[PDB]
């Protein structure tokens, strides 16, 4: 039918298989990322704290390059493939151009790969949405979001996966220049957004911090719990 | 081709009023050996085009096969069009140039005669692809021995008759036989006119050796 | 690139040995049988090769061998170096895209 | 062995003017020590505002001229307009550099009017490099012809002289004289001189007989 | 009836029939009749070429093809497939002359083209040809040879046959014709008579008769019948039809 | 019928549409989205004038004696060219619906001089599941059995089935189909036996036949469909007869000029020049 | 397949039935029956004979061209039953394979190996989806250097067994029963005896007495290993001998 | 009714023995605009009725250059038309490069026929849904060739293809003898009259919607548009 073949256009003009890939993305766990002054931070809500499992092997936030990060929401295997391809392309660009990879360049490459996989009906689209965030050569913070269709958009603050809409409303309501100015403010904003996403929070918070001229580092559960306690104290004060 | 092996001596062509006449010997020499003394180095392409080659005879046979196949196919089409001698000349030039560019050229120098639309055509195609049209042509040692006489006669009388052209070609053949080690007594006169291509049988030259006794 | 120039005169011949053998068989059939035999064999080969493992996995090509008459013939090609023991394997998706003509 | 190139002689020369672009060449096709033919102009007209002269290996010259004609037809079909002289020069440079490792043994000089109606002369090397000049001579006798062109058209080494603009008649007389001198001192030149004058009205062809060998 | 087995040429019906080939045969039957009679001197063709409009130039959509200097080709069924198969036969004959140096025998060429058609009917990627044709030639050694090829891929020699709408009527006329004892002239006259007889002026408004022959009188070279002889044959056919 | 790859198993589509039902034959989310689609597709009959939703059917609210319905761009163009300028026609009601396949509107008109005479210019397409809902909204459940319904529509020559090929057929030809009660002259050849109509005109005609309402359906088969003057020229015989004889006044001159206006303002096919 | 795999179990060659049978191969056998003719091959201790009924449908049809007896090589001949075009294609393939075997191995291909190659190709046909089995049957005969006369029948499924008396066509079962009865009664099986056995078997199963023009007979003997097509006069002589006794 | 199964694909034969995809391609070319092509004893003229998507949008060209002596009239699918025009241009260039002579029209039409036949036999490809009226001059004189979406081609003295082309064909068939022996201006006027016959009675030919392509003995293929077709329109009789 119209909804079974990727290449077939629906009478309305839809490529329903791309939209089904988007639905698969929505099925994934929530990933939230905001942009700040010389501070870019990512956050992914873990679906469940599965005991007897190594958290290192199921991380959702990875580093494409020393100056670029990426978080995904959707099929994990597709995300791994896209991440490997993005890393390879980043190194190839650093080889051929000798300059550090811009966030725009890698975001465009990922979008092009996803669109190319959407081209033919033999290949299914990648069912992932990626939040590529990092610093450019000049150090300007950059946040971007790609879709299975192959469209990339810059965002000041975005959320993908399940419950993305509510977290996006939260961010829109609580995005201010003062919050962006302070790195701790941005981190607290992301903690609050993810806590809104998942009531339990705490151990389920998977937050990563990247600052100017500093490699990606993932805050340990101790720091995440400290920030959660700070948010709880602030709420109690009110 | 890389080794010429069996080679041709020379082809002389000259255009007169009413058509063109070309001549070639019936000899294919391996080295200095005569070996094959009855081969024909002139072919009839169509009713208004003729062709003579000097060089590797195997390549000449290959070109014979190809050109005959093209003519047969075009006749099968039956659309009322015929390959003019100029078209055959252009095709041969392109083929030779392509073979040269592939570093595997055909080792023949080709003389193309023809008479279409009341216009005598006389073409020259070399191994590399050098192509031009001249009132008189001569390949191999022809360009050194016979070409002088042809050019002198033509620049004296711009247009010749059939008999005059035939006599001049016969004199050139006699000179070539006298002063060319790869030449042969038997040659083949081929003339193309309004009637069509007419290839005469084996003809011999009038040898003269009085200077042998003079000494 | 200089890689286009063969390192050994025999290298170019034996590198395309199977392709040259198939071309010679097609030429002989077409000289004798006609246009039908080469076209038939070409379609048959295309059909058998269309179904196989993905590029990053070594295929058996049993039907192709039977059609080519090599099911009971062994040459240096089969024994000297094993396609199974490649020692060099690229990314699965990259190889699939390369075969598909995308790259 | 096998030599893909042979030198067939031929001398080309182009002079640019305010409203004219003369492209002149000889008609001597000679390979080795013999003369293939006495009627083979080296200048072929491409458009109504461009004439190209080719000297060197005759086969390469013919192939290049045919390729240029085909590319001109393709450009006309695609862009729905005739290619300009500068565009032809750039395309010829790209074509020549395409066969860089098997270079065309052709000396190419493009002469014709530009979009402003001014004579434009482009000189090419076998590899493909080109530039715009006011006058240039190519072929076997290029070295013989160039000094007089520099002396007269360029007014070089002429102290206290009037830089009179180059008129058409003076250009034709200069071309005839230089080619006569070339026929005198160069064995690859003579027979006849084909002069193609490219003006806004069209292309005029003039033939001047030179002394035979 | 192969209701669920008539979609692909690679599918067998329960009774063992490939219905795509039969549909190709029916498509051939949809076309106007083309007949060809072989006699002692040679082979004469003839086709009931219907003119669709007076605008078309005389000779458009010619159904007679010269695949070789000595081989004719009268086609029926889909015209495009007929042209394609004519080109295939031309390539085959060209190739035989180039390789073995002599004109391809009629039987060998018929076998080659028939096997090409069968190969096309074998697979599902391609569809069987929708045309049937007659290959005819005359030689001093081989003699007069006439062959017919079916979309299935058969190749059978005939003394006379027809392909098209009125195949059976033309076949009966040829059956009651004694071709083995007549010359080429009488044969072409009778071919014109048969073509005029089998033509249905009611369903088909008008037609143009194309006649070609190959035989001793043509020096073993296929050619169209001269206009004078063709007009004489048409006049004889008119007289026969009137009575 | 996918054939995406070599070994893909394809299934022959069924002309009866069984496979759709077989796949169809729950989850609360699926039921919710299905009901959302159902209420998105249902026809909503209302009037833009005063924005008063027409819960009551048109037939119940006003008594009609002559309902001329035009479906297709050419039919509504013909009506706009010929009947509007003859008198005065104000908008009363307008059906709004959404389909997968698609100036698409269904607007109803009524004559001020004689309100009993109404009109319908359905320039939009109606899906197979919505013609009955449209009939419910317009005619209601209780008909009058005293209405002269002249249904006008344009079709393609390819749809018409006959021994002659489509090309040989005279392209600007029209046929008629009338109910048992409609005893007036059809003025047109009756539709051939194998031919069938399966769109809104068919729904209206079946409704009229079932409930004994005199109606006639006109089908103008044409090779072109995008605002063609020949289609309306072939429609003219319809107004030449009764029913539409009085509605259109004796002023063909303005209608002929008016008909040109509609054809000039047309969109050509970019794909096919 | 490029068009696409069919749905039903019997609608495609590759997919299996619930039992595991391939219905397309059986339909190819039904096509062989649809050929309309019957072929009988008998193996003796001196020669191998193949007899098939020749049915020229129309008088205009040239009887010389109508034949189902083809020679693969100078010593091996075959009789084909089934679709004419498919049989011709298989004959061409067998000829090419025999020529290639002679070129590559330096000696003429045995009959068993020829059918083994043909059956391998047939199996390839039955395994893939793009192609379909050939609707024809091949019966090869020939004299082996050591094993003497050899008769092999060579089917679409890919079965290449050899037989002492082969039958194929519409009346395959009845011909097989008749040949089994004859074989159970072991005669000397001379050349003329084998020819008579084949002809009488065909006549019995077809319930008709053949004239010289209704059958074509091909023979190959130890003394004369070349594949020989019996001339119509010789077939008539054999028929007269049968009638007399 | 029973042809649904055999209607979808081009490699599937119908029980009646007719491929429906080819006929649908013919319907597609019919659905296009109308062109008229006729030839005299010395000239070949192609007159086309250009269509504009909107009043602001310019009329889409329907006469396309192929060679110095060959031109075509567009009818049907535009993309397939451009592909065919590119193929024919390449063929003509190859002919003039190899044999250094113009490619005969008949040979080009045969090549087009084979090229458009190739898809109709293979799977996964559709017939070229474009019809072309090819006007050219050869040693045999003017030529008018009609190319159908079905690979078969026709040689015509005058032909019209497209929407409402039956009236144009009737007019052409009415005055064939006049066409054969007439002046160039008379031939162009005849073509314009046929194109007008295609048009509705109310409508009339204008400089915007008329494109003319003429090739003759000493005249190369030139396309006239707007002010260039105005001279031909002037002097035309009232319908």
């Amino acid at each position: 039918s119209y909804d079974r073949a990727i290449t077939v256009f629906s009478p309305d003009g839809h490529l329903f298989q791309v939209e089904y890939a988007q639905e698969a993305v929505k099925k994934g766990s929530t990933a939230v990322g905001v942009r700040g002054r010389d501070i870019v931070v990512l956050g992914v809500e873990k679906k469940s704290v599965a005991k007897l499992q190594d958290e290192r092997t199921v991380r959702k936030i990875c580093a494409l390059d020393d100056n670029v990060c990426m978080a995904f929401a959707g099929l994990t295997a597709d995300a791994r493939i896209v991440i490997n391809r993005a890393r390879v392309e980043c190194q190839s660009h650093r080889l051929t151009v000798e300059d550090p990879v811009t966030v725009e360049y890698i975001t465009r490459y990922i979008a092009s790969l996803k669109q190319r996989y959407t081209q033919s009906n033999g290949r299914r689209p990648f069912g992932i949405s990626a939040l590529i965030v990092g610093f450019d050569f000049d150090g300007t913070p950059r946040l971007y979001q790609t879709d299975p269709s192959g469209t990339y958009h810059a965002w000041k603050a975005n959320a993908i996966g399940r419950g993305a809409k509510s977290v996006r409303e939260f961010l829109e309501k609580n995005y201010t220049d003062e919050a962006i100015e302070t790195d701790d403010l941005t981190i607290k904003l992301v903690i609050k957004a993810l806590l809104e996403v998942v009531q339990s929070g705490g151990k389920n918070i998977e937050l990563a911090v990247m600052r100017r001229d500093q490699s990606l580092k993932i805050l340990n559960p101790e720091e995440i719990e400290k920030y959660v306690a700070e948010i709880e104290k602030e709420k109690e004060e009110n | 081709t890389q080794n010429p092996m069996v080679t041709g001596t020379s082809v002389l062509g000259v255009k007169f009023e009413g058509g063109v006449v070309i001549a070639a010997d019936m000899l294919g020499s391996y080295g200095s050996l005569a070996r094959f003394r009855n081969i024909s180095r002139i072919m009839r392409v169509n009713n208004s085009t003729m062709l003579g080659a000097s060089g590797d005879y195997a390549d000449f046979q290959y070109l014979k096969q190809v050109l005959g196949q093209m003519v047969i196919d075009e006749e099968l089409l039956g659309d009322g069009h015929s390959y003019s001698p100029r078209a055959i000349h252009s095709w041969l030039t392109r083929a030779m140039y392509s073979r040269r560019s592939k570093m595997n050229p055909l080792w023949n120098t080709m003389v193309i005669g023809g008479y279409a639309d009341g216009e005598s055509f006389l073409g020259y195609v070399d191994m590399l692809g050098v192509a031009y049209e001249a009132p008189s042509l001569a390949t191999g040692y022809g360009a050194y021995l016979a070409q002088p006489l042809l050019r002198e006669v033509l620049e004296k009388q711009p247009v010749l008759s059939q008999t005059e052209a035939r006599d001049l070609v016969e004199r050139c053949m006699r000179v070539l036989y006298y002063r060319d080690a790869r030449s042969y007594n038997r040659f083949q006169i081929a003339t193309v006119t309004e009637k069509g291509v007419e290839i005469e049988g084996p003809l011999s030259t009038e040898t003269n050796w009085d200077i042998a006794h003079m000494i | 690139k200089n890689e286009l120039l063969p390192s050994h005169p025999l290298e170019l011949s034996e590198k395309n040995f199977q392709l040259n053998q198939d071309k010679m068989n097609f030429s002989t059939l077409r000289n004798i049988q006609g246009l039908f035999a080469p076209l038939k064999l070409q379609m048959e080969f295309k059909a058998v090769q269309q179904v196989q493992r993905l590029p990053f996995l070594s295929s058996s090509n049993l039907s192709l061998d039977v059609l080519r008459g090599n099911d009971e013939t062994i040459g240096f090609e089969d024994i000297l170096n094993d396609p199974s023991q490649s020692e060099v394997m690229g990314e699965p998706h990259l190889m699939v895209e390369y075969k598909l003509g995308l790259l | 062995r096998f030599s893909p190139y042979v030198f067939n002689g031929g001398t080309i020369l182009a002079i640019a003017g305010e409203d004219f672009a003369i492209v002149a060449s000889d008609t001597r096709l000679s390979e080795g020590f013999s003369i293939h033919t006495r009627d083979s102009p080296k200048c072929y007209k491409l458009t109504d505002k461009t004439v190209i002269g080719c000297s060197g290996f005759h086969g390469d010259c013919l192939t290049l001229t045919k390729i240029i004609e085909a590319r001109l037809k393709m450009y006309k079909h695609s862009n729905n307009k005739a290619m300009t002289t500068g565009a032809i020069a750039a395309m010829l440079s790209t074509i020549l550099y395409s066969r860089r490792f098997f270079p065309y043994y052709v000396y190419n000089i493009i002469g014709g009017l530009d979009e402003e109606g001014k004579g434009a002369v482009y000189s090419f090397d076998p590899v493909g490099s080109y530039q715009r000049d006011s006058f240039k001579a190519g072929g076997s006798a290029s070295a013989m012809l160039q000094p007089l062109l520099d002396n007269q058209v360029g007014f070089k080494n002429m102290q206290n002289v009037e830089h009179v603009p180059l008129s058409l008649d003076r250009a034709m007389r200069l071309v005839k004289d230089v080619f006569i001198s070339a026929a005198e001192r160069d064995v690859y030149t003579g027979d006849a001189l084909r002069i193609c004058i490219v003006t806004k009205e069209g292309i005029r062809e003039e033939t001047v007989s030179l002394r035979k060998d | 009836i192969g209701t669920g087995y008539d979609l692909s040429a690679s599918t067998f019906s329960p009774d063992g029939r490939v219905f795509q080939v039969e549909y190709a045969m029916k498509a051939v039957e949809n076309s106007s009749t083309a007949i060809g009679i072989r006699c002692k001197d040679g082979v004469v063709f003839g086709v009931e070429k219907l003119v669709l409009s007076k605008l078309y130039e005389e000779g458009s959509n010619k159904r007679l093809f010269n695949v070789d200097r000595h081989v004719g080709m009268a086609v029926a069924g889909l015209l495009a497939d007929a042209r394609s198969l004519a080109d295939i036969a031309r390539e085959e004959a060209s190739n035989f002359r180039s390789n073995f140096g002599y004109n391809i025998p009629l039987k060998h060429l018929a076998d080659r083209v028939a096997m090409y058609v069968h190969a096309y009917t074998l697979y599902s990627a391609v569809r069987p040809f929708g045309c049937s044709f007659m290959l005819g030639s005359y030689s001093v050694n081989d003699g007069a040879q006439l062959y017919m090829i079916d979309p299935s891929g058969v190749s059978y020699g005939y003394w006379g046959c027809a392909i098209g709408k009125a195949r059976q009527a033309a076949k009966t006329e040829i059956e009651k014709l004694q071709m083995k004892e007549m010359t080429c002239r009488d044969i072409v006259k009778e071919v014109a008579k048969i073509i005029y007889i089998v033509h249905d002026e009611v369903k088909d408004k008008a037609f143009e008769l194309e006649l070609s022959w190959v035989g001793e009188l043509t020096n073993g070279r296929h050619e169209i019948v001269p206009k004078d002889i063709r007009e004489e044959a048409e006049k004889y056919a008119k007289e026969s039809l009137k009575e | 019928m996918a054939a995406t790859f070599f070994g893909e198993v394809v299934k022959a589509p069924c002309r009866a549409g069984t496979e759709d039902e077989e796949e169809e034959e729950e989850t609360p989310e699926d039921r919710e989205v299905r009901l959302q689609l159902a209420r998105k597709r249902e026809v909503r009959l209302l009037r833009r004038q005063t924005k008063t939703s027409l819960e009551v059917s048109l037939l119940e609210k006003y008594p009609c004696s002559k309902f001329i319905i035009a479906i297709g761009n050419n039919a509504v163009a013909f009506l706009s060219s010929f009947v509007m300028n003859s008198g005065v026609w104000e908008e009363v009601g307008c059906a709004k619906l959404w389909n997968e396949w698609c100036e698409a509107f269904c607007v109803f008109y009524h004559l001020k001089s004689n309100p009993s005479v109404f009109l319908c210019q359905c320039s939009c397409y109606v899906a197979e599941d919505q013609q009955y809902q449209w009939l419910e909204k317009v005619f209601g459940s209780c008909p009058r059995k005293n209405m002269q319904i002249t249904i006008l529509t344009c079709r393609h020559v390819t749809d018409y089935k006959t021994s002659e090929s489509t090309g040989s057929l005279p392209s600007p030809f029209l046929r008629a189909l009338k109910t048992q009660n409609f005893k007036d002259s059809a003025c047109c050849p009756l539709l051939e036996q194998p031919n069938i109509v399966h769109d809104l005109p068919a729904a209206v005609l079946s409704y009229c036949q079932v409930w004994k309402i005199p109606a006639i359906l006109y089908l103008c088969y044409t090779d072109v469909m995008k605002l063609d003057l020949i289609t309306v020229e072939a429609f003219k015989p319809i107004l030449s007869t009764r029913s539409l004889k009085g509605l259109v006044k004796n002023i063909p001159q303005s209608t002929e000029i008016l008909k040109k206006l509609m054809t000039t303002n047309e969109i050509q096919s970019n794909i096919y020049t | 397949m490029s068009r696409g795999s069919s749905a039903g179990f019997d609608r495609h060659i590759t997919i299996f039935s619930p039992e595991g049978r391939l219905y397309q191969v059986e339909y190819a056998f039904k096509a062989i029956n649809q050929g309309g003719l019957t072929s009988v091959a008998v193996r003796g201790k001196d020669c191998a004979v193949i007899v098939t009924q020749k049915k020229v449908p129309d008088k205009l049809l040239d009887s010389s061209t109508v034949t189902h007896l083809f020679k693969i090589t100078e010593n091996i001949g075959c009789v084909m039953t089934g679709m004419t075009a498919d049989s011709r294609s298989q004959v061409q393939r067998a000829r090419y394979e025999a020529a290639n075997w002679k070129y590559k191995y330096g000696y003429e291909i045995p009959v068993d190996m020829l059918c083994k190659r043909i059956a391998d190709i047939s199996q390839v046909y039955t395994q893939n989806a793009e192609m379909r089995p050939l609707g024809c049957c091949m019966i090869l005969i020939g004299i082996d250097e050591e094993q003497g006369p050899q008769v092999y029948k060579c089917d679409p499924a890919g079965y290449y067994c050899g037989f002492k008396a082969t039958a194929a066509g519409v009346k395959q079962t009845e011909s097989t029963s008749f040949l089994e009865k004859k074989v159970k009664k072991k005669f000397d099986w001379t050349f003329e005896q084998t020819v008579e056995t084949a002809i009488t078997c065909l006549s019995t199963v077809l319930s008709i007495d053949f004239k010289p023009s209704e059958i074509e007979v091909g023979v190959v003997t130890v003394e004369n290993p070349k594949f020989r097509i019996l001339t119509e006069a010789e077939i008539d002589a054999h028929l007269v001998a049968l009638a007399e006794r | 009714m029973f042809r649904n199964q055999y209607d979808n694909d081009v490699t599937v034969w119908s029980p009646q023995g007719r491929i429906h995809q080819i006929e649908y391609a013919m319907e597609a070319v019919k659905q296009g605009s109308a062109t008229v092509g006729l030839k005299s004893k010395t000239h070949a003229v192609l007159v086309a009725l250009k269509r504009a998507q909107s009043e602001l949008a310019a009329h889409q060209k329907k006469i396309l250059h192929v060679d110095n002596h060959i031109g075509i009239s567009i009818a049907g699918l535009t993309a397939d038309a451009r592909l065919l025009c590119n193929f024919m241009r390449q063929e003509c260039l190859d002919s003039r490069f190899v044999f250094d002579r113009p490619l005969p029209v008949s040979r080009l039409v045969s090549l087009i026929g084979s090229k458009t036949q190739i898809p109709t036999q293979r799977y996964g490809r559709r017939p070229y849904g474009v019809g072309l009226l090819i006007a050219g001059y050869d040693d045999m004189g003017p030529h008018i060739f009609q190319t159908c979406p079905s690979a078969n081609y026709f040689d015509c003295r005058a032909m019209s293809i497209g929407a409402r082309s039956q009236s144009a064909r009737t007019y052409l068939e009415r005055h064939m003898s006049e066409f054969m022996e007439c002046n160039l201006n008379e031939l162009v006027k005849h073509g314009l009259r046929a194109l007008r016959e295609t048009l509705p009675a109310e409508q009339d030919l204008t400089t915007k919607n008329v494109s003319i392509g003429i090739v003759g003995k000493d005249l190369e293929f030139t396309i006239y548009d707007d002010d260039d077709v105005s001279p031909f329109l002037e002097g035309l009789e009232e319908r």
Side-chain angles (χ1 to χ4, degrees), chain E residues 39-57 59 61-96 98-106:
Chain E
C39 56
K40 45 186 278 282
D41 313 288
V43 180
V44 182
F45 291 114
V47 307
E48 179 193 344
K49 197 197 72 176
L50 319 169
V51 308
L52 295 323
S53 179
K54 304 170 263 66
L55 291 174
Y56 290 144
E57 193 95 31
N61 309 70
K62 46 180 257 182
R63 306 262 293 275
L64 299 178
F65 300 93
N66 313 317
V67 310
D68 199 25
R69 294 184 292 186
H70 63 121
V71 182
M73 188 163 188
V75 305
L78 205 56
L79 263 288
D81 298 8
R83 300 174 209 269
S84 173
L85 280 179
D87 303 358
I88 294 301
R90 288 175 177 176
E91 298 183 29
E92 293 282 19
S94 172
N95 87 17
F96 198 94
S98 299
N99 277 3
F100 310 112
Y102 69 105
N103 287 358
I104 181 162
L106 199 284

Side-chain angles (χ1 to χ4, degrees), chain C residues 67-80:
Chain C
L67 290 176
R68 283 202 279 93
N70 297 152
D71 60 354
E72 300 147 350
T73 281
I74 308 182
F76 292 121
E77 302 96 30
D78 298 313
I79 80 185
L80 284 182

Side-chain angles (χ1 to χ4, degrees), chain H residues 78-94:
Chain H
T78 313
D80 289 359
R82 254 210 300 282
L83 269 169
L84 259 67
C85 185
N86 288 123
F87 160 78
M88 301 155 68
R89 287 168 175 173
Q90 198 30 234
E91 290 314 299
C92 289
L93 291 167
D94 288 349

Side-chain angles (χ1 to χ4, degrees), chain B residues 80-81 83-116 118-125 127-151 153-166 168-193 195-198:
Chain B
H81 297 279
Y83 280 148
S84 59
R86 190 165 277 100
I88 302 298
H89 179 77
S90 177
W91 178 89
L92 202 47
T93 307
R94 297 288 99 241
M96 301 285 218
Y97 189 86
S98 67
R99 291 294 297 260
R100 164 215 158 268
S101 300
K102 294 182 221 143
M103 295 303 278
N104 194 27
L106 310 143
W107 222 271
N108 306 54
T109 310
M110 315 279 317
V111 169
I112 309 192
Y115 182 76
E119 222 76 27
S120 305
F121 176 84
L122 185 48
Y124 179 99
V125 188
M127 199 213 330
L128 311 184
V130 179
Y132 62 91
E133 325 173 7
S136 62
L137 289 174
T139 74
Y141 265 73
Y144 318 124
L145 288 167
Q147 186 78 279
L149 307 174
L150 296 159
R151 251 202 281 261
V153 172
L154 288 187
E155 271 146 0
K156 195 151 297 316
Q157 167 173 349
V159 48
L160 322 172
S161 80
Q162 193 173 350
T163 61
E164 275 179 311
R166 195 189 184 92
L168 185 55
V169 163
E170 271 186 0
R171 288 154 46 187
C172 294
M173 274 295 146
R174 194 171 293 105
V175 170
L176 273 188
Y177 179 68
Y178 279 154
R179 289 273 141 87
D180 179 8
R182 303 293 172 267
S183 54
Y184 198 60
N185 203 347
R186 294 171 49 188
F187 58 92
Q188 197 151 45
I189 302 289
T191 179
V192 57
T193 169
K195 304 283 151 263
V197 171
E198 314 255 11

Side-chain angles (χ1 to χ4, degrees), chain B residues 90 93-94 97 100-101 103-105 107 124 127-134 136-137 143-144 147 151 155, chain D residues 2-6 8 29 31 34-40 57-60 62-63 66 99 102 104:
Chain B
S90 177
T93 307
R94 297 288 99 241
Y97 189 86
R100 164 215 158 268
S101 300
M103 295 303 278
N104 194 27
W107 222 271
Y124 179 99
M127 199 213 330
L128 311 184
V130 179
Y132 62 91
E133 325 173 7
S136 62
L137 289 174
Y144 318 124
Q147 186 78 279
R151 251 202 281 261
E155 271 146 0
Chain D
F2 163 53
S3 180
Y5 313 93
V6 308
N8 300 83
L29 197 66
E31 151 175 350
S34 301
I35 303 178
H36 272 342
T37 175
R38 296 203 198 273
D39 193 17
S40 289
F57 175 42
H58 196 54
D60 272 344
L62 296 168
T63 310
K66 285 184 107 180
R99 205 103 75 84
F102 200 57
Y104 286 105

Side-chain angles (χ1 to χ4, degrees), chain G residues 123-144 147-179 181-183 185 187 189 191-194:
Chain G
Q123 189 276 350
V124 172
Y125 284 2
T126 72
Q127 188 136 31
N128 197 283
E130 189 48 287
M131 300 136 297
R132 61 161 174 93
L134 287 186
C136 51
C137 191
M138 193 187 256
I139 308 172
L140 290 157
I141 58 173
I143 309 296
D144 174 64
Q147 309 208 254
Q150 270 178 337
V151 178
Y152 282 74
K153 158 163 84 146
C154 210
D155 91 4
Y159 203 50
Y160 84 109
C161 182
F163 316 73
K164 308 166 187 175
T166 291
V170 180
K171 301 295 176 58
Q172 191 202 320
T173 58
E174 314 69 350
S175 297
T176 307
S177 65
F178 185 98
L179 294 167
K181 297 169 196 303
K182 298 300 287 288
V183 163
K185 316 313 170 295
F187 309 174
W189 297 103
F191 170 79
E192 80 304 350
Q193 285 181 292
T194 49

